């Protein structure tokens, strides 16, 4: 009526457990080899005698007269890096200045080009991720920039995280303090005329916390031109003003120590040519600015909760509309689950008291190369850093229909959103508990 028979052993009734597990010493040796914990074979047999493979011949038979089903809970555990190549978090296109030249007697010829910089897999934490990006902009300048004109003064594109506009005085037209108040509010990206960044093929966008208000329109390009209204205002010549006590004030600090120009639009304007995203969003025209088509969001280092799909092709019936095949990247799905990664949050009031000390701690100002320029400076570390953290996930799918004849060797397969094994799985295993559902 509801048996469960196996080769030659006492028949069992009503229910039991078949175990899908990678570890088994025997099968690892033989079976999987060129496989990994995301696409492997395993014997469900569990009987000490019998050579695996020869096991493959045997079968667990759930009484034929009834349609069976089984509860499937699984234990999935990864250890995927915040920033890696497979997830698309190690690359990102941006347009920078390539050459600054003296041409055809009087012309200033500026040549800009798009280029894709890559990051060294792993390096978690958001802030640091920013830094690694800024550094990659530089590392490039080091291989092309300088040796083709282009000064530091005109480095296009830099990810910062502050509100260049806190000091700002509605009359002066300047950041009175003479310094862009060094506190971190949200990541944003700053651009110089003519350049900009593109994330079309990168989740890092999600790390900065900047998304399109219309996601499905593939094409994340944020040009200098887009950051309308909201160019970082200029600094008051704190020195002049004070010593001068008319009043100098109108004097908007044009350079800095080591004399770098703050590219001011004209000898008059209080504004600089440096455009900030964060500004355009909440300080620019809400109806036509950038706030119109992009959204200011919480960072999230994981870069985006993605899901993984399970499949047990040789043991569960194929769900409603999937068709059975043998193409690993199209197997039927039997369970979906978010990919095991969380955002742990910490507190480091030590940030920026630490950037200050961190710089001495790290024997180099590698990230802060321009410790004077109020722009190109090293963005403030925000209190509350986030870090992707891997965690085992004791998930639980529902009862799923089973085949009344379970093969000795079952194939287990965890796929990702785009349907492809996921290299970062360290442990995957599931427990199935069959039971009756109705009869034929």
């Amino acid at each position: 009526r509801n048996s469960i028979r196996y080769s030659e052993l006492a028949p069992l009734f009503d229910t039991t457990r078949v175990y899908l597990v990678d570890n088994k010493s025997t099968d690892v040796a033989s079976l999987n080899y060129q496989n990994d914990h995301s696409n492997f074979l395993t014997t469900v047999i569990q009987n000490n005698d019998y050579s695996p493979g020869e096991a493959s011949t045997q079968t667990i038979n759930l009484d034929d007269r009834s349609h069976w089903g089984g509860d499937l809970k699984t234990i999935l555990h990864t250890n995927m890096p915040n920033v890696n190549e497979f997830m698309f978090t190690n690359k990102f296109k941006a347009r920078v200045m390539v050459s600054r030249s003296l041409t055809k007697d009087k012309q200033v010829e500026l040549k800009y080009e798009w280029v894709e910089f890559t990051l060294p897999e792993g390096n978690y934490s958001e802030t640091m991720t920013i830094d690694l990006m800024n550094n990659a902009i530089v590392e490039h300048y080091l291989k092309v920039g300088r040796q083709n004109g282009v000064l530091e003064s005109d480095i296009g594109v830099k990810f910062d995280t502050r509100n260049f506009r806190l000091g700002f005085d509605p009359v002066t037209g300047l950041v009175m303090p003479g310094v862009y108040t060094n506190e971190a509010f949200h990541p944003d990206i700053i651009l110089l005329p003519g350049c900009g960044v593109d994330f079309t093929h990168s989740r890092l966008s999600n790390l900065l916390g900047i998304r399109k208000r219309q996601p499905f329109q593939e094409g994340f390009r944020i040009t200098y031109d887009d950051l309308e209204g909201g160019n970082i205002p200029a600094l008051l010549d704190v020195d002049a003003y004070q010593a001068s006590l008319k009043k100098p004030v109108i004097k908007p600090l044009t350079e800095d120590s080591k004399k770098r120009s703050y590219n001011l639009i004209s000898n008059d304007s209080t504004f600089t040519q440096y455009r900030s995203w964060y500004l355009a969003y909440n300080y620019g025209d809400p109806q036509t600015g950038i706030r119109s088509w992009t959204l200011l969001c919480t960072p999230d280092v994981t870069c985006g909760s993605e899901q993984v799909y399970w499949s047990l092709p040789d043991m569960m019936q194929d769900p409603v509309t999937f068709r059975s095949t043998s193409q690993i990247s199209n197997f039927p799905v039997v369970g979906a689950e978010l990919l095991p990664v969380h955002s742990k949050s910490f507190y480091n009031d030590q940030a920026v008291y630490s950037q200050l000390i961190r710089q001495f701690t790290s024997l180099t100002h590698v990230f802060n190369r321009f410790p004077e320029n109020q722009i190109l400076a090293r963005p403030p570390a925000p209190t509350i850093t986030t870090v992707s953290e891997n965690v085992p996930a004791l998930t639980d799918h529902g009862t799923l229909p089973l085949r009344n004849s379970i093969g000795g060797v079952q194939r287990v397969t965890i796929t990702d959103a785009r349907r492809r094994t996921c290299p970062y799985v360290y442990k995957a295993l599931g427990i199935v508990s069959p039971r009756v559902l109705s009869s034929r």
């Binding site: 530089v138 300088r146 530091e152 080591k258 100002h365 410790p371 004077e372």
Partner: peptide, 10 residues
Amino acid sequence: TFNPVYPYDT
């Protein structure tokens, strides 16, 4: 005429 691009002073 070589920029090491590094503030050695400090």
